[PDB]
C-alpha cells in the first residue's frame, strides 16, 4: 500500500523546519561517522597533497522523523536530503572536493522507525599533507584527514567514530605504487577557535616509501658511472690525453643526470639524502679526474711514480667508495 | 521549545525585504571583518599570482533581525543565508575563487538577540601579485589582498578591521618551501571610482625567497663546469684533440644548462641575477677556450712565451673567477 507510505512521509515533512537542528535548545545531537576508503589515487610530493575516494556515512537521530505502522527501513530518493536537516560537516585540510553526480548525485537517505537517519555520500577529496623530505627517498610520512563541524559548537553537536576502530574499512585493500600503508589511526577530540569549541575527528595513515624504483632510477646510474671511472686506472697512460677528456665527459654526464633528477622533485630548501649521495659520487669522480690529471702531468719525467700512483688509486678508490657506501647505508637504515 | 523558536524565526523573516540594506535610507551600516588564514598553497611567478585559503568572517547589525525572550545566540543552518541581506564584498585582485561545498557549502550564520549577524565563509582565492624579478632569486616580494564593496558607496557601508591589529590570525600557519613570511600589514582607506567612493581594506604580506634550492640546483653545476674548464690549463699543448674536445664539451654543457634554466621561467624582458651569473660563467669558459686558441696560435714561434702564458693562466683564471663571485655576491647580498 504505497498511499499509506506517501501519507506518512507527507505527514513527517509537514511543518518541518530545516533551519533548526534536532533537539534545538537542548542537549547536543550526537553524530556517528563511518568511512569506507575506496581508493587512494595519487600522492604528490610536489603539491604536498594526496587524493582519496571514500563512502562517507553519517548517523544521527531526529525524533521529528519517527514513524509508526511501517515495519521497514525507508530508503528515500536522495532529493529528500534537500528537505531535511543534515550536519554541516567539512574537512579542514582539503583543497578541492566534490560529490560524484553520475548518473545522479551519489547520495543516500535512509530513515528508521525510531527516527534514526542514515546519510551517505561518495566523495573524492584532495587533502593537504605536509611532508618531511630530509630522509627522502628513505622517508616515512603521516597524512591525516580532519573532520569538523563548521557552524555548530560542542554545545550543539558531538562527533564519534561509530564502531570504534572498526569505523574505517578498506584500508588493507589499498595498493600504492610508491608507498605502503604501515598503520592507520582514529582520534577524537575538541578544537577551540575564537568562536568556540568544535568537535574533531582525525583519521591518519603512516606511509613508508618503497625503495626499488629509486634503486633502479637514480642510485644505480650514479654507482655505475663511479665504477666506470675506475676502469681508467687499468688502462696504460700515454701522451694522447684521451683519459682526461673521457673523465671530464663522464663528470659532465653525471652533472647532466643529476640536474634532471632534481628536475623531477619539488623545490625544497634543504639537502636530501639522495642529494648527499649524489654529491658524494661527484666528489669521488672529481677526485679520480684530478688524480689522472696529476699522473698525466708528472708521467713524462717520472714514469715509475706515475705507475705507483695509478696502482695505489686502483686499490684506494674501491675501498673508500665501499666505506662511504657502508656509512651512508648505515646512517639512513 | 522548538515550536516557539520556529515561530520566532518565522516572525523575524515575515515582512523582511532582502532587497534593502539595514538602515536603508539612513546612516551607513558598519561591517567588521576578520580573516583566519589556513594556508598559502602556492606562489607562482609564471602566472604572477598566489593561492590563499581563509576563513572570512563579517560582523554587522541588522535591527530587523532583533528578537526577545530567548537569551541565546541562534546558530542557524547556512541555507538561511539565502534569505538574509549580506554585504556585497568582493576581492579586486582575485582571478578565480570558490566557496568549499563539501559536505555542504562551508558557510555559517549566527544571530544575536540585539540583531547582530555573524556571517562566515571558507574561501580559496587565487589572487594576482605582480613581481619584480630583477633580483631573482634573491628578490623580496609584497603580495596583497584588496577587499572592497561593489555596489554600496561610503554613504551606505563602512569597513573596519575588527580588533585592529589582531583582525588577521593564522599567519604562523603559512608554510612555503620557497618563501618565508617577514611581515604582514593591515590598511583601511577609500578608493574613488567614477561611480563614487568605496571603502577598501588591504592585507599585505612581505615574502623573502630562500636561496638554498638555487645554490643546490643552479649555481653549483655552472661553478663545477667552470672549474672543470680549468683542467685544460694543466694539459700539454701537444694534445690538441683532447683540449678541443674539453672545450667543446664544456661549451655544449653550459648551453644546455642555460637553455633549460631559462626555459623554466617566465619570459620577462629584463635580466635577472641568475642570468648575469650564467652569462659570466659562459664568458669565463669561452675565454679559457680562446686562451687555448691563442696559445696554439703562438707556440710554434715562441714556445717559452706560450708555456709562460699557460702557467700564468693557471693562476689568473681562478683568481678572476673568485673576484667575479665576490663582487656578484656582495652586490646581490
Amino acid at each position, epitope marked *: 500500500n504505497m498511499s499509506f507510505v506517501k501519507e506518512t512521509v507527507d505527514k513527517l515533512l509537514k511543518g518541518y523546519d530545516i533551519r533548526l537542528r534536532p533537539d534545538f535548545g537542548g542537549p547536543p545531537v550526537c553524530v556517528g561517522m563511518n568511512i569506507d576508503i575506496a581508493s587512494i589515487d595519487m600522492v604528490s610530493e610536489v603539491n604536498m597533497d594526496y587524493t582519496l575516494t571514500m563512502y562517507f556515512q553519517q548517523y544521527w537521530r531526529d525524533k521529528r522523523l519517527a514513524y509508526s505502522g511501517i515495519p521497514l527501513n525507508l530508503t528515500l530518493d536522495n532529493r529528500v536530503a534537500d528537505q531535511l536537516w543534515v550536519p554541516d560537516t567539512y574537512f579542514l585540510n582539503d583543497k578541492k572536493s566534490f560529490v560524484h553526480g553520475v548518473t545522479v548525485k551519489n547520495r543516500m537517505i535512509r530513515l528508521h522507525p525510531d527516527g534514526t537517519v542514515l546519510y551517505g555520500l561518495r566523495i573524492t577529496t584532495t587533502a593537504a599533507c605536509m611532508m618531511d623530505l630530509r630522509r627522502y627517498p628513505l622517508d616515512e610520512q603521516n597524512c591525516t584527514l580532519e573532520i569538523e563541524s563548521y557552524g555548530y559548537t560542542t554545545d550543539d553537536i558531538e562527533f564519534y567514530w561509530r564502531g570504534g576502530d572498526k569505523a574505517v574499512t578498506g584500508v588493507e585493500r589499498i595498493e600504492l605504487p610508491q608507498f605502503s600503508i604501515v598503520e592507520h589511526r582514529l582520534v577524537s577530540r575538541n578544537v*577551540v577557535f575564537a568562536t568556540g569549541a568544535y568537535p574533531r575527528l582525525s583519521l591518519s595513515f603512516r606511509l613508508k616509501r618503497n625503495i626499488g624504483y629509486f634503486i633502479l632510477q637514480t642510485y644505480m646510474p650514479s654507482i655505475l658511472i663511479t665504477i666506470l671511472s675506475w676502469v681508467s686506472f687499468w688502462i696504460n697512460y700515454d701522451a694522447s690525453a684521451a683519459r682526461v677528456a673521457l673523465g671530464i665527459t663522464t663528470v659532465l654526464t653525471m652533472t647532466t643526470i643529476n640536474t634532471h633528477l632534481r628536475e623531477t622533485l619539488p623545490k625544497i630548501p634543504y639537502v636530501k639524502a639522495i642529494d648527499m649521495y649524489l654529491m658524494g659520487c661527484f666528489v669521488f669522480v672529481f677526485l679520480a679526474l684530478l688524480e689522472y690529471a696529476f699522473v698525466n702531468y708528472i708521467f713524462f719525467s717520472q714514469p715509475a711514480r706515475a705507475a705507483a700512483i695509478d696502482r695505489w688509486s686502483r686499490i684506494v678508490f674501491p675501498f673508500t667508495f665501499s666505506l662511504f657506501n657502508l656509512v651512508y647505508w648505515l646512517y639512513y637504515v | 521549545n522548538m515550536s516557539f523558536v520556529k515561530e520566532t524565526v518565522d516572525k523575524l523573516l515575515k515582512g523582511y525585504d532582502i532587497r534593502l540594506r539595514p538602515d536603508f535610507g539612513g546612516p551607513p551600516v558598519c561591517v567588521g571583518m576578520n580573516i583566519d588564514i589556513a594556508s598559502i598553497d602556492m606562489v607562482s611567478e609564471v602566472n604572477m599570482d598566489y593561492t590563499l585559503t581563509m576563513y572570512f568572517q563579517q560582523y554587522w547589525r541588522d535591527k530587523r533581525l532583533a528578537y526577545s525572550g530567548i537569551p541565546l545566540n541562534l546558530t542557524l543552518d547556512n541555507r538561511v543565508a539565502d534569505q538574509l541581506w549580506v554585504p556585497d564584498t568582493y576581492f579586486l585582485n582575485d582571478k578565480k575563487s570558490f566557496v568549499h561545498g563539501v559536505t555542504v557549502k562551508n558557510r555559517m550564520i549566527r544571530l544575536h538577540p540585539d540583531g547582530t549577524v555573524l556571517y562566515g565563509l571558507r574561501i580559496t582565492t587565487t589572487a594576482a601579485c605582480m613581481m619584480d624579478l630583477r633580483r631573482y632569486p634573491l628578490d623580496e616580494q609584497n603580495c596583497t589582498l584588496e577587499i572592497e564593496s561593489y555596489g554600496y558607496t561610503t554613504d551606505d557601508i563602512e569597513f573596519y578591521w575588527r580588533g585592529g591589529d589582531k583582525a588577521v590570525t593564522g599567519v604562523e600557519r603559512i608554510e612555503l618551501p620557497q618563501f*618565508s613570511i617577514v611581515e604582514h600589514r593591515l590598511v583601511s582607506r577609500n578608493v574613488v571610482f567614477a561611480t563614487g567612493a568605496y571603502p577598501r581594506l588591504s592585507l599585505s604580506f612581505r615574502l623573502k625567497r630562500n636561496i638554498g634550492y638555487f645554490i643546490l640546483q643552479t649555481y653549483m653545476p655552472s661553478i663545477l663546469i667552470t672549474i672543470l674548464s680549468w683542467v685544460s690549463f694543466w694539459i700539454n699543448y701537444d694534445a690538441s684533440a683532447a683540449r678541443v674536445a674539453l672545450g667543446i664539451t664544456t661549451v655544449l654543457t653550459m648551453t644546455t644548462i642555460n637553455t633549460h634554466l631559462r626555459e623554466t621561467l617566465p619570459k620577462i624582458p629584463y635580466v635577472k641575477a641568475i642570468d648575469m651569473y650564467l652569462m659570466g660563467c659562459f664568458v669565463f669558459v669561452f675565454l679559457a677556450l680562446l686562451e687555448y686558441a691563442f696559445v696554439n696560435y703562438i707556440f710554434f714561434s715562441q714556445p717559452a712565451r706560450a708555456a709562460a702564458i699557460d702557467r700564468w693562466s693557471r693562476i689568473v683564471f681562478p683568481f678572476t673567477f673568485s673576484l667575479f663571485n665576490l663582487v656578484y655576491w656582495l652586490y646581490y647580498v
Partner: nanobody
Amino acid sequence: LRLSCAASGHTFNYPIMGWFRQAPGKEREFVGAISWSGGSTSYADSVKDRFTISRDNAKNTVYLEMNNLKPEDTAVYYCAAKGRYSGGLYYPTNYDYWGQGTQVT
C-alpha cells in the same frame, strides 16, 4: 632570566611551541608562540616589547628571555607543543605535549 625548552622526537608533526604561565589563583595564561621553521613569533599584550622568544633547530631549543620583570610575573611556567591543525594559538586545550612546570618569583 631565561627559560629553555628542548624538544625531541616528532617535532615535524608539532611545528609550533607555545609558552604558558599559571598563577596560584588564576587559570593558565598564554605568553607567546614560536614556529620551528618560519621563525614567526607571536606575543600576548602583557609581555609585548618585554619578553622575547627565539628558536634554534641545531639542538631543537626555544628560549624565552624575560626582561623588565614585575611582581605580577610570579607564576609557574610551562612549555607546550601544538599540532598543525590544532586550532587557535591562545588556548591551552589545543596543545598536546606539555613540559614540566618551572617556578619563577
